[PDB]
């Protein structure tokens, strides 16, 4: 319980969520790079 509650603290969750967002953004740019504009 205590460990999960600690994982629920603001800094830990912010770090985890920002890492997740950076990860999926990086992957999206990896599979569809140089995306200046939308495909037709």
């Amino acid at each position: 319980e205590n460990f999960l509650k600690y994982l629920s603290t603001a800094p830990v969750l912010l770090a985890a969520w920002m890492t997740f967002t950076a990860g999926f953004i990086i992957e999206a740019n990896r599979f569809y790079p140089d995306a200046l504009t939308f495909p037709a």
């Binding site: 205590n2 460990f3 509650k5 600690y6 603290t9 990086i26 740019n29 990896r30 790079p33 140089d34």
Partner: protein, 741 residues
Amino acid sequence: TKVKILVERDATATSFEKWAKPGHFSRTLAKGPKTTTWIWNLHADAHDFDSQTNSLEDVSRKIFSAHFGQLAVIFLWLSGMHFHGAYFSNYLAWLNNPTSIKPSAQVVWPIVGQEILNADVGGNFQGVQITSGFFQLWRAEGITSEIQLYWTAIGALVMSGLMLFAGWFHYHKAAPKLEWFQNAESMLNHHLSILLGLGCLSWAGHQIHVALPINKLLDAGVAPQEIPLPHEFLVNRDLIAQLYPSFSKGLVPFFSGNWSEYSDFLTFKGGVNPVTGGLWLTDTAHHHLALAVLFIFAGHMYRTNWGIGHSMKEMLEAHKGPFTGEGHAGLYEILTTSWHAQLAINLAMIGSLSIIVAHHMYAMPPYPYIATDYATQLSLFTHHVWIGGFCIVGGAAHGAIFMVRDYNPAKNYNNLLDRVIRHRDSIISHLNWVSIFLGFHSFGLYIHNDTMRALGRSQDMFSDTAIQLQPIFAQWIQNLHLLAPGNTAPNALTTASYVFGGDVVSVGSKIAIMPIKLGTADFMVHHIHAFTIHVTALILLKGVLYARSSKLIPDKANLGFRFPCDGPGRGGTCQVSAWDHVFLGLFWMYNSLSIVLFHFSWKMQSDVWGSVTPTGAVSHITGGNFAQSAITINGWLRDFLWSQASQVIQSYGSALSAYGLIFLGAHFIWAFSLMFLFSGRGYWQELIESIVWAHNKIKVAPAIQPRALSITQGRAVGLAHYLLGGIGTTWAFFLARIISV
């Protein structure tokens, strides 16, 4: 047995319950957040153990285990460095051809086009060129293979794990009692005789048995593949006797006293190795052996359990003269009852030592092929200079903290501290006068030269072809050091460093090290250095002495170490605390070290670093424009900043583009810091009030009320961003100016 081991078993229970109660350590923060200020406080008082418990034993146990944690972090950092050398570096190719191959141990994933940062360093390898001199260090150790680097990283990881376990064990399982910590004599004996004595002895053994033969074979041109493994140099003595035909005699000369027989690999030639451009490995081996002997001897000075030894308490009490009342009576209690005093001394010494290291390493390149790596030399010098300045200012800050918190007048009656506090006014007034005198004269020399050069009166300036200010004393010292070999150091074949005088040591057509001539520009810049150092000392010493009281605030001590002010009364009372004195001293230290780094960079580029021809002609990087252009402010602005900033501004589209981006980012952060530095808290509080009204109008309102940063936090953030911006700007400038080569 007065010195004995005392511990408490199971001092603290291990559980995660506390991890879910942030701010548990402090009594005020344990009540939960009412406003956002709480958040900041939780990160500001995290390591302020003294303010969390009134017992010294608990603070001591926290400090010990936090030091264990720091050691674990450092070992993890070393493990990472070594692993990136083994798996992601061109260390082998650099080994084969050190001159041409550029060191690099970092690789970037190609994700957004950042793969351009993968430079064409060489050796069929692409990566970010490193400037940490790790390749030269590893070569000096005779690594010669990536398996050894891999195992070095594994050992570092295991050591980091051991440090973490030791911290946990010595807090939660076996926490030493306070009496255990208060053993200065035993601690000094153990840290001198073993940590520094046997450390030197073991490293000397390594050099004698591993680094020496391997590096000698490498200098002879043996390819790393054909060099036998280091363990092969420990089993068959003859295999080493070929290189140094003194092992054949073995250890019998050592015990018989005929140490002269070891002069083959224990030399005192000094100078620099012409092939690699670094110090002779035999010289370093003899050096470390002598240091090991001295440290082991010095580790027996203090009395621990057997009558013989020195009692530092009596030693201090004994030194008292007519001018100083009670002499050093009460300093032992101060240094064994307050961690802030010890931290102040240790930080000041570590910072000064780091600066000494920076000065000595460039003058006498200790590792092979580090002298001609201009990028490494500059990076190491500037890094260690910055570390030294930060440590010095931290020592000042913690001295002030000790004065505010751990200073007790009852135990400090008419001793040195009392008397210093009692003529602090005279000390500060005279330091102020000398600071003003130095500033006026030194900087007005530059202003005068600039004015005369602008008016066309070049014959009236303070230049070599004009009114001359020759550093005669420094030149005399250089001459004496030049003449030392054979006369005052008869057993030393060559001068300690070629800076003072002698030949031009060049490796692979690059000037590794050459004599540095001192002219009027050197005189002026040295006096500028002295001025800045004196002003920084003024600020920090004033903060320390007036930390408890002043003619403005007779009761400053009750206000604490760091507080914003004491109101707008008595005129104004802004930045009256010692913490604010540290805040200003950090700015002045940054300024002084910036001047030091500019002096070093320009002088080395214009007078030492360069190229040589087969005949012997010297061509420096900037053509020796330091003598006639370093004597005016406009000269520094034009020939140093504007001229040498071409690399950063033009680095776009190349592997150094990251340096240009960081140049701009550092400028941005430096300018951003001014927002906190100039503005005050009231404006931002009112703006936040308006923004909070806007949020509330939509039924969005955080339970944790937003608050503008406290005054002290505003200053701290401004200073932190100012320092980051300045340091990053110079970092990018130097690295791009010295990597386009």
